[PDB]
Amino acid sequence: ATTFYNVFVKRNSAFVATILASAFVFDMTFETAIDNFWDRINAGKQWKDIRHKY
Amino acid sequence: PDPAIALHEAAAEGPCHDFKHHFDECVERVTKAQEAEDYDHAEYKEDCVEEFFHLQHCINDNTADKLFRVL
Amino acid sequence: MTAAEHGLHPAEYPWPQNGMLSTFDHASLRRGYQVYKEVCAACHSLDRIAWRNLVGVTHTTDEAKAFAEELEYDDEPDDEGNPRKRPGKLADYIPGPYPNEQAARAANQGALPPDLSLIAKARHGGADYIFALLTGYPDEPPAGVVLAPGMNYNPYFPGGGIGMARTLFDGVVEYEDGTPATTSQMAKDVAAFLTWAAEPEHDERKKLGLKAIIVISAMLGLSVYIKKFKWSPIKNRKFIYNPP
Amino acid sequence: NPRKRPGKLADYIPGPYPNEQAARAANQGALPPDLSLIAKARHGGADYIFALLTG
Amino acid sequence: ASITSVVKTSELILKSPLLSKIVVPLAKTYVKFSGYRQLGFKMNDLIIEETPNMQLALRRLPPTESYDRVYRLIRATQFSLSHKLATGNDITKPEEDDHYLIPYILDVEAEAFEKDALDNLEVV
Amino acid sequence: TDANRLFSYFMIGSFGMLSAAGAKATVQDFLSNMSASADVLAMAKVEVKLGAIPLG
Amino acid sequence: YMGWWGHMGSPPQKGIAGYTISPFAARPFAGVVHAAIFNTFRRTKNQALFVILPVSFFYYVWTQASEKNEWLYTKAGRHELAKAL
Amino acid sequence: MALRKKNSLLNMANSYVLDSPQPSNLNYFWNFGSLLALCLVIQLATGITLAMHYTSHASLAFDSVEHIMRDVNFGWFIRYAHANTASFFFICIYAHMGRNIYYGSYKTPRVLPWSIGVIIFLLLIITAFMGYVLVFGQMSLWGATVICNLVSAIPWLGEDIVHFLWGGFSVGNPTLQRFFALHYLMPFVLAVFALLHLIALHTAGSSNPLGITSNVDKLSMHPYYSFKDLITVFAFLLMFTLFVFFSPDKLGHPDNYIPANPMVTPASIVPEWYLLPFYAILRAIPDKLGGVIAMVAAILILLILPIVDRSIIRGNAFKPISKLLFGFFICNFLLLGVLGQVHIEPPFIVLGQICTIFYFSYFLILLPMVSTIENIFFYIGSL
Ligand code: HEC
Numbered sequence A: 001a002t003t004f005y006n007v008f009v010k011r012n013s014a015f016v017a018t019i020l021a022s023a024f025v026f027d028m029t030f031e032t033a034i035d036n037f038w039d040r041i042n043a044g045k046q047w048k049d050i051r052h053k054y
Numbered sequence B: 001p002d003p004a005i006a007l008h009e010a011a012a013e014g015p016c017h018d019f020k021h022h023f024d025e026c027v028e029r030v031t032k033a034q035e036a037e038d039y040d041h042a043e044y045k046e047d048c049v050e051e052f053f054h055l056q057h058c059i060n061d062n063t064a065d066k067l068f069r070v071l
Numbered sequence C: 001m002t003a004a005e006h007g008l009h010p011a012e013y014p015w016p017q018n019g020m021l022s023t024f025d026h027a028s029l030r031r032g033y034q035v036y037k038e039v040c041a042a043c044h045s046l047d048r049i050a051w052r053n054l055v056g057v058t059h060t061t062d063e064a065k066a067f068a069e070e071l072e073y074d075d076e077p078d079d080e081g082n083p084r085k086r087p088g089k090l091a092d093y094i095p096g097p098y099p100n101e102q103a104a105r106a107a108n109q110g111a112l113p114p115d116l117s118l119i120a121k122a123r124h125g126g127a128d129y130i131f132a133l134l135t136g137y138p139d140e141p142p143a144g145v146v147l148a149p150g151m152n153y154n155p156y157f158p159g160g161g162i163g164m165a166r167t168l169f170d171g172v173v174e175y176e177d178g179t180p181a182t183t184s185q186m187a188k189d190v191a192a193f194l195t196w197a198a199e200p201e202h203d204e205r206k207k208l209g210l211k212a213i214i215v216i217s218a219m220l221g222l223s224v225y226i227k228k229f230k231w232s233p234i235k236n237r238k239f240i241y242n243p244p
Numbered sequence D: 001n002p003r004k005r006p007g008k009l010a011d012y013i014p015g016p017y018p019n020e021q022a023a024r025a026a027n028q029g030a031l032p033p034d035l036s037l038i039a040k041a042r043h044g045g046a047d048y049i050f051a052l053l054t055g
Numbered sequence E: 001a002s003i004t005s006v007v008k009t010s011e012l013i014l015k016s017p018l019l020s021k022i023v024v025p026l027a028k029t030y031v032k033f034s035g036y037r038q039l040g041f042k043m044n045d046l047i048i049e050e051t052p053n054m055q056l057a058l059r060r061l062p063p064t065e066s067y068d069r070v071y072r073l074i075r076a077t078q079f080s081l082s083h084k085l086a087t088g089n090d091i092t093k094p095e096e097d098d099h100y101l102i103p104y105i106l107d108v109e110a111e112a113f114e115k116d117a118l119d120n121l122e123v124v
Numbered sequence F: 001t002d003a004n005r006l007f008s009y010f011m012i013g014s015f016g017m018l019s020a021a022g023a024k025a026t027v028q029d030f031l032s033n034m035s036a037s038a039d040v041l042a043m044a045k046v047e048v049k050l051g052a053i054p055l056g
Numbered sequence G: 001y002m003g004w005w006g007h008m009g010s011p012p013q014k015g016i017a018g019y020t021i022s023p024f025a026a027r028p029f030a031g032v033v034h035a036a037i038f039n040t041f042r043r044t045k046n047q048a049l050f051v052i053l054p055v056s057f058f059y060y061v062w063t064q065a066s067e068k069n070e071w072l073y074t075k076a077g078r079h080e081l082a083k084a085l
Numbered sequence H: 001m002a003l004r005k006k007n008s009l010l011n012m013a014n015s016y017v018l019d020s021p022q023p024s025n026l027n028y029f030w031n032f033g034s035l036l037a038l039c040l041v042i043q044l045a046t047g048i049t050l051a052m053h054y055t056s057h058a059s060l061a062f063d064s065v066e067h068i069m070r071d072v073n074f075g076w077f078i079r080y081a082h083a084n085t086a087s088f089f090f091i092c093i094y095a096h097m098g099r100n101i102y103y104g105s106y107k108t109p110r111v112l113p114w115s116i117g118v119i120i121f122l123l124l125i126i127t128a129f130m131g132y133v134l135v136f137g138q139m140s141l142w143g144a145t146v147i148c149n150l151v152s153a154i155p156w157l158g159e160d161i162v163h164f165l166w167g168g169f170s171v172g173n174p175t176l177q178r179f180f181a182l183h184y185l186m187p188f189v190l191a192v193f194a195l196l197h198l199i200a201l202h203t204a205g206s207s208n209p210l211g212i213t214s215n216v217d218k219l220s221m222h223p224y225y226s227f228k229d230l231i232t233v234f235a236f237l238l239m240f241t242l243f244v245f246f247s248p249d250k251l252g253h254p255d256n257y258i259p260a261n262p263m264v265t266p267a268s269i270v271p272e273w274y275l276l277p278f279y280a281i282l283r284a285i286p287d288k289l290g291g292v293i294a295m296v297a298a299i300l301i302l303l304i305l306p307i308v309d310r311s312i313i314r315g316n317a318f319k320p321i322s323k324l325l326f327g328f329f330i331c332n333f334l335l336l337g338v339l340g341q342v343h344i345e346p347p348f349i350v351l352g353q354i355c356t357i358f359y360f361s362y363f364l365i366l367l368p369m370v371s372t373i374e375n376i377f378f379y380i381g382s383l
């Protein structure tokens, strides 16, 4: 736990780098997660669901 | 056959029966008044729009959800 | 004003797209386009929608190009500078039934059928108003209403007398998906379609709003923790006073 | 239906050709420019127009 | 307004038996509802001080009174920001709500208003 | 304890992370308005005849 | 009227000791449950009349006015409307 | 000496946003200032973006707004953000003015920031009105027609002035192009006045909810108010998000999605919600010129608060009668708003007149009376 602090938080350069890398990962995964969720709650409604008829 | 036809009829006979009666009474009065002569040379000509709105507004409140459920 | 002068206010129908997380039903949008094409387009334009807008919403690229290629549009002049027509492309706008307002009014006993591209945003009520209006022609006008010539009674329309006659009757359209084309079904579909036409970003907008709501909520929660954390020295300050 | 009217003072002086293509077709490919600004649109101005027409 | 105005008008009211009979009970209630005592203020602590006259009156306070005032303002500011009220000894009791500043501001203003009057004197 | 400080920096850092993710999303979406719009992108794909064109 | 740090324009302070603790040493949300419930109730109760009185009055006014207006533009209200114009 | 204090440029930022000494007890109503700064930034960013897509010609304006909605990437967002943030700008500005009236921020020594503020409020009204015209929908046109025909009431020269502002005999292309240029410019002027009212305020510093001096107990603007301002920024953005993404047309009027038609007059010319109180005041006076003067006076009368408030105490925290009077004043200002959108019919005609009298009588009669009486009650009540 001290180790975690020392590595990622103590130096601001490290902390900001950790924040931006986290932001990148969050951004990518959150996009994917919302996409899947949105497709499930709107199932059979969207173009992707009816496109197969054509 | 249009689902709305039956739902509107059911709502008129049921929850909006009081409003149905008002509109009916109104139409009776107005038709009778139009039947009488020198109606064209009267100051105020009565309509039934108000009663119609009350009825339709009621019917819509009792029907909207049911109608969209069968489409 | 009298309620007549305002028009009857339309019911709140439970549209598929009502609801913070709900998109349009695209199968309804497609059916609604077919109603527009077979019924409304006789009198009403949809000038702000291009063939490309239907692609990936209601139609595949092939179906939409087929629709465009059936029409003739004004090309650039030939080499002798004579005017020319070309077949339509996806970037073309859906063409109107009348060349100008005057032609439109002449065909409609003076009344000018508005463009429908924005009508769902341009009337109080939106889809509900369009649905109510198309389904709201009584068999007989309320006793004592005097309709102007070429007007039809419709209580949802302000003033009661509308220049547009009832147009949807059971089986005026034959839906390609086997859905029974009842008056109410066709009105629901076309009203959905016109709502999409007015706000084509609607599906994307609500998904991005969901993301925004989530992130901004989290940042709001954290901002409150951080504020309370930074302020705690000031809130927790205590004094001891010894008069000098 | 479209209609024509007689011109009024607010009307612009009308061109001899309906479009560029018609213009070029009538002039063995060359496009006679509009002259409304030609005196400002060439180095020389009036002198250029005078020299060209007499030269 | 001037404190002089407030003081003079109040004295007119306290003189008239009728007026005092109806106004003094109201004013006591008003001050109870006002609730400045629940932040440990004395009435005079609330008078607007960003005026040259009031700045001068504050400079004329005896050092003790001045130090006490600074503590009451700091204490009240802390209760304000905490959204707490005074409890116990911090609540100003009616007997402790003394007009410590009114004498000083009345003297400052007396001179300032005399100065204005005398600037407008006409020899006869 | 280091545990104690680390917790509060996890809150500050989460807030910085969402702010960074939110700012990227905001900037990227908002500036994309400047990229070619749908009408422009449609006027690509020009089709041309070849029957008109003589040799040389 | 306001200075800057070092000469803010405070009357001289003396005899006040201020104490506080570090944000890292404090629980920032200490007694938050008690405050959210009991403190908010106290503060709202103390201010309730100043909101309730004007809101209730103006809502009543509006309600009366909107109901009269609605009634005047009915059939029943024809005569009263004729007089009001 | 630290760089932020040494360097002239940095020192100016420092004096406003970092070392600025603030009272330690400002409550959340002191956050509307920074929200109005955020609104002003969002409006500049979205506004300049829309200007890159908008065409000011009347033959193309409405179409250019449709192009923004339909073709420009995220154009829908930029358009709705700009339109809704104009509503939020007025919510925040009324809140900020409300805060200033309730806490007596207009009293000495802050009369100058207050008076400049009243001008900022006028510029915001003008800015938002011109922006509304740029869409060139039915409400745009009929708004410009009616509002610029109020100027016709100016005696002798009124008609001439209207034609000069329109650039023609009716609202048309010249009017639209000039409103575009001015609507672009006015927000920069508004920003400068916003900055002037802060520079003016810097001499006294912020007032505080107790209305006492804060010279005794100051807090640096950063980090305390920086982090407090983030809470309301996120609260604001949550409200913004609900409107912009989920209900973008809730605050607007559908009539503006019909292209301007000088022939057809819309059902109802009602202004945007935030102008409605002033509109109600104008309708209350039967005379055309009277109405216009009253409407302008309803804004300029704020300039006399420093005179008509006779209290020896700053702000309403401790003044129960003033708090009640202020409650009635604020609710009446909302009732005026509501009366601005009803039809000119009984019984709202008389009601609108009474509410207009109440609005003015607050500044002219009640506040001077009530503040005088409270002075006497504080003094007698504490003897
Ligand atoms: C043959 C004529 C005709 C057909 C078919 C027609 N309309 Fe219309 N429509 C009109 C005319 C004319 C008006 C204008 C009426 C008026 O302003 O009095 C109009 C008005 C409207 C309005 C707006 C009413 C308003 O509030 O101004 C909507 C919405 C509308 N039509 C939608 C449709 C839809 C949807 C269909 C068919 C699915 C349709 N119309 C079919 C002629 C037609």
Ligand code: HEM
Residues within 6 Å of the ligand: H029, H030, H031, H032, H033, H034, H036, H037, H040, H093, H096, H097, H100, H105, H106, H110, H113, H114, H116, H117, H118, H120, H121, H190, H194, H197, H198, H201, H205, H206, H207, H208
């Ligand atoms: C763009 C519009 C405006 C912006 C951005 C703005 C911004 C601010 C800011 C940041 C402050 C200091 C912080 C605060 O107290 O909230 C402030 C204070 C103030 N503003 Fe505004 N303001 C604006 C409009 C107005 C208006 C319209 C008025 C008055 C009608 C006004 C009057 C004041 C006053 C009197 C203060 C001092 C209040 C005090 O701290 O006691 N401002 N403003």
Ligand code: HEM
Residues within 6 Å of the ligand: H040, H043, H044, H046, H047, H048, H050, H051, H054, H065, H079, H082, H083, H086, H089, H124, H127, H128, H129, H131, H132, H133, H134, H135, H183, H184, H187, H188, H190, H256
């Ligand atoms: C205080 C700042 C501003 C306010 C209050 C404001 C307000 C408005 C409003 C109310 C509209 C009508 C919105 C609509 O219904 O569509 C609008 C439109 C517009 N504004 Fe602004 N505006 C501001 C700043 C700016 C700035 C700086 C620009 C820079 C050019 C700008 C450009 C536009 C454009 C181009 C339009 C027309 C496009 C449209 O309606 O969306 N605005 N503005």
Ligand SMILES: CCCCCC[C@H]1C(=O)O[C@H](C)[C@H](NC(=O)c2cccc(NC=O)c2O)C(=O)O[C@@H](C)[C@@H]1OC(=O)CC(C)C
Residues within 6 Å of the ligand: H012, H013, H014, H016, H017, H022, H026, H030, H031, H033, H034, H036, H037, H040, H190, H191, H192, H194, H195, H196, H198, H206, H221, H225, H226, H228, H229
């Ligand atoms: C960067 C330095 C340049 C100086 C000007 C920049 C801005 C500036 O000074 O920012 C500050 C953060 C300021 N807040 C306050 O005064 C403030 C003070 C006390 C309490 C709180 N809130 C409570 O919790 C505050 O919010 C603010 O939002 O005022 C903007 C309007 C200023 O913009 C301008 O005038 C220029 C232009 C963009 C309008």
Ligand SMILES: CCCCCCCCCCCCO[C@@H]1O[C@H](CO)[C@@H](O[C@H]2O[C@H](CO)[C@@H](O)[C@H](O)[C@H]2O)[C@H](O)[C@H]1O
Residues within 6 Å of the ligand: C204, C208, F027, F028, F029, F030, F031, F032
């Ligand atoms: C201070 C600024 C510094 C310079 C940074 C330069 C940033 C400019 C980048 C513009 C990039 C846009 O690039 C494009 O972004 C949009 C979102 O906007 C993404 O689009 C994706 O999400 C959006 C919503 O967010 C949907 O409409 C779309 O269906 C989907 O594909 C694309 O997948 C990407 O191709």
